[PDB]
Symmetry: C3
Subunit: 455 residues, 3 copies
């Protein structure tokens, strides 16, 4: 006679399609393969980043805490599963007592000493009504909830290592462009110091060129420390240090990522691990309903023992000294003060709070995926505009070079065209860094990379 109630799936409050507008693109229907099935070996193309994630899934320690928390709750489920069963041990019953002359058996103050070992249960409570069954069911639901949360931890780790590597590549490209702008400012100050010695340029243009060079040196040192900062952050996120023999990974100009189907908002309820973690927390509260409801009914205990008793220790292995104890007990609360109804509606409160936790998880997951959809809809237009800016600034540089080569234009204006080209490329690097990090965050938000390859 089990008393866990019938499970009822809570409805999702999310509308059945991802939101439309001027910033989004056109959605598709159901996908043959969702995002939670293409692994981090196919979605991540370049070999260096695949080797870094293959290192960081093993050497990092937060994923190790996640997997060990899973195996800890294996042990914690095994506790309750064995608590459903007896504990067949021994015990030693020894009562050496002194009573007055009125209370004893001899009519005199006497020291009586009966002591002898015996095996059997120590108040083993048998489970007629399903309260121990529902406690181990709660333990099993908590176990597989946390082994869904381990997949959620691996998802966040793969996304964080990917964003750390992409910011490392983009920030060392920024460092190279600031080094090149420092080179052009140094050449312009060299020419202004040359024209200052001869006498064409006054000392005001010399001080202006010197302020420009010192600003470029400050920018160069700041990007040097930023490369050091996010390289140390990647050393943290890999667990171990960066290995030496990494392959020549693909730069930012190639297609570093693959296309991912968005799908339906109702498809997300079975694939993202945070959703299906909060769902099994809700099933654990569903088992706690039965754990609190199975207190109203008669709980049955057993106390059995079997072993030899004696008076002296010397005559404990002989004939006629066998013994055995059998003691059942039933128990039924006629009128408590309201602790059982308080435990029942407290379990119902925990059930509805975990309903709210599951539904909040669906809402935040839908918001993160709609964030990723809006960014994937707008960054293609932003980077098309930015690459047209880079191409127009490069054509302006080539025309300033073509005016310089024939002689009608100075070298300082050619260096101004070089620095406007480098400002255009420094903007392009950061816009593509924002595109790639939001693409990785969208892949995390849909189903994440838990499988290694496509299944």
């Amino acid at each position: 006679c089990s008393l866990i109630p019938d499970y009822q799936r809570p409805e999702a409050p999310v509308a059945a399609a991802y939101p439309q507008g001027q910033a989004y693109g056109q959605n598709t229907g159901a996908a043959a393969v969702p995002a939670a099935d293409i692994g981090w070996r196919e979605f991540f193309r370049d070999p260096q980043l695949q080797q870094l994630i293959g290192v960081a899934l093993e050497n990092n320690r937060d994923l190790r805490v996640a997997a060990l928390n899973v195996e800890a709750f294996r042990a914690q489920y095994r506790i309750q599963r064995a608590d459903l069963f007896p504990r067949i041990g021994v015990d030693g019953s020894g009562t050496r007592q002194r009573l007055p002359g009125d209370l004893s058996t001899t009519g005199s103050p006497a020291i009586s000493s009966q002591y002898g070992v015996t095996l059997g249960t120590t108040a083993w409570e048998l489970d007629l009504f399903g309260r121990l069954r529902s406690l181990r069911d709660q333990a099993l639901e908590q176990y597989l909830a946390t082994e869904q949360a381990q997949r959620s931890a691996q998802t966040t780790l793969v996304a964080s290592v990917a964003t750390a590597y992409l910011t490392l590549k983009a920030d060392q490209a920024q460092l190279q462009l600031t080094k090149d702008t420092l080179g052009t400012y140094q050449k312009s100050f060299d020419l202004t110091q040359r024209s200052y010695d001869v006498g064409v340029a006054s000392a005001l243009d010399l001080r202006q060129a010197q302020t420009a060079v010192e600003g470029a040196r400050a920018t160069l040192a700041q990007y040097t420390r930023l490369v050091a900062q996010d390289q140390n952050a990647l050393v943290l996120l890999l667990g171990s240090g960066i290995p030496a023999n990494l392959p020549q990974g693909l730069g930012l100009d190639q297609t570093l990522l693959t296309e991912v189907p968005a799908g339906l908002p109702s498809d997300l309820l079975q694939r993202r691990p945070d959703i299906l973690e909060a769902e099994h927390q809700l099933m654990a509260a569903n088992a706690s309903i039965g754990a609190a409801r199975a207190a109203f009914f008669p709980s049955i205990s057993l106390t059995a023992n079997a072993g030899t008793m004696s008076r002296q220790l010397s005559g404990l292995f002989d004939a006629g000294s066998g013994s055995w104890l059998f003691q059942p007990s039933i128990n039924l609360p006629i009128f408590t003060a309201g602790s059982l109804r308080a435990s029942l509606d407290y379990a119902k409160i925990q059930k509805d709070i975990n309903v709210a936790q599951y539904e909040k998880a669906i809402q935040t997951a839908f918001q993160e995926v709609a964030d990723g959809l809006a960014a994937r809809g707008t960054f293609t237009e932003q980077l098309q505009a930015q690459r047209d800016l880079v191409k127009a600034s490069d054509e302006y540089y080539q025309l300033a070079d073509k005016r310089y080569r024939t002689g009608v234009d100075n070298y300082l204006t050619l260096l101004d065209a070089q620095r406007s080209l480098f400002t255009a490329q420094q903007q392009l690097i950061t816009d593509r860094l924002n595109q790639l990090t939001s693409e990785v965050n969208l892949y995390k938000a849909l189903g994440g990379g838990w499988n290694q390859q496509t299944v």
Copy 2:
């Protein structure tokens, strides 16, 4: 006799007046109508914002978690109140035992059955020294603490919906200005393309106009993204989507929300919810002192019982079989190994943990209110300087338009003046967003939006 210690509250470490200087305003005297009295309908002037609070206030999930955690701790208080009273029920306790020949009555190994069903209690205590009653009002004051926590959760919900809606309107106005800057850049590029196709302008300023247009299209894609992400954030924070029948929402430069009287710093000790939460955790710590003190005094307990006992199982109809037990049980710990000093010491240490927690909540409340007062004091000067900036740039554009319409300058300088006026309007909208965000956080920090009208 009860044993809970008497409680006077700790005084506030923060000053008796809000800070003064060049940033703040003059101090108001007191509050006849304080800040927590004014509801969100007599504070928020948008009917759209009133409808969005009316949706989000009962259709959220985290506020639902708080409002059900209140019910959870009422269930825990019902547990602790019901454990004052005995466990009056029915039980049937049979013992079948084998005894060896030395321990039996007749001297021969035989059996002896004790099959008797009884009614009554097992091991309940009455504490006339005040241990269970101190645990009872500890549970009561944890309930009062978490209902104050529920009020603070609704307060932060109201502040977050208001800030998300104000940033949504500000990003709408940002997008409507970025479309016009893109219009003026595209029109200036069409003029330079016509000037290039005839032959007046070179290719260099044509590439400059192309880079300007592509910068405008990049920032247009960025603001479409940012508007879509802000709508997704407000879909998260309402709980459901934006509903259908929204009324008219007024502008951003009008009176979006009325002024709030600040009052004294001591009025936070009664109006603010989180300070009252720390207050009730402090008096629950005093109740826990009274519980962990009352174990020195002797506990009086008894296991009352009344039933029908017999050797045989089939019989209880006899008139003489009205069996009953009384069994009182009184204990007294006279000298342990310093267990009870350690328990009383740990409870007193928890009390002056919660003292420090209480005045740390006071100090963070005072800091949030003082930053809100500084924002009130400085944003009037900043926003008036910003409106004078916008008036100056508007008059400059009007004079450039008069200069163009008479015929002296061309249309490119008119488009440059128009872009300067658009940049001034953009910075005005950002500063007004900052003012409204800081005053919503000030209203959140003073007393919050709990009730609607007066009591």
Copy 3:
């Protein structure tokens, strides 16, 4: 017998030296005096900041919570250490029997009773195989973990008050320079208003003068707001107000601090506090697996009595009415169905979890220290570039002042030169702020805010 397993030979999860690159200067090798025995009075040369740290230590409330948590775990260690020693305490027992005539010892249904007062113990277990010994060892090592957590809280509080005071003083300097820029713009607007009222400059130059002045007055109000917010944040981090009798502090130009020798990565895990509290949580997990391994063994328990009993109230303290009870019990389980095995596995997994958290703590310490070393290596050459920029703009301003005093250029070009000099000093002051706040963060990351008294 004790069953706590042996401690393991430590492997390093880190390279044996701080990294090298363009940012990193050069390793200093090992150090004689580490970074933890440099107290905050021989490190912070600023006497005003030293009194501010003194107020922040004897007045803030997070240190009250931390030191009171250490006191709470002293009480918890005593309440778990006291479980070895026998809880002896005089008590009072009694029964009042109603057995029927089938069950009575005489043959008629009668009333029987047996009561008495006995000095003795109740269900005391003798810790023969070290389970409660292992639990008090666990409580002792969690006490040491709580003490190292208090040391970590104190060094982070010293760092936070140093950085808050430092940003306060730097934003005082920022407010003073933007008040000077507002002065120069107001004087340039006075000159342009005269040059308009006479007739030379048109109204468009007057509108550029107004847009400059209103931009500057907006930024002046913004920095008054920001100084007020940062001073209220410093009031939060102190817990008490700024005291009145402060000495004259040192400005940001001269050395407020000195460089602390970093050393090797091998004395982090001896000097840093959070690594040590992770180490003591690991030791507590070793004691937990000691108790779990001792759980297989037989757990002997005892009761005892030395008092008197009788059946009558008026004669229980007569001669020869003494009583005495001895109750030994050897108890070992044989069949546990995988419960004690499961709790053993759960404690081994707690050991592995605390190993992983200790190793994570070493990795986060190494990452934060390496970021501090990056900042120390780069901010020197960046600040040299910034000071050369300020000196070149100051020479440019001296040349523009010579051109003004002779009579070649008007006063508006000198105000343009002051506009450039002031923003040069703006960027210099915020860069020196970044250097000093990252130096304080490195000093926290090596873990040296603890000692003021002797060792």
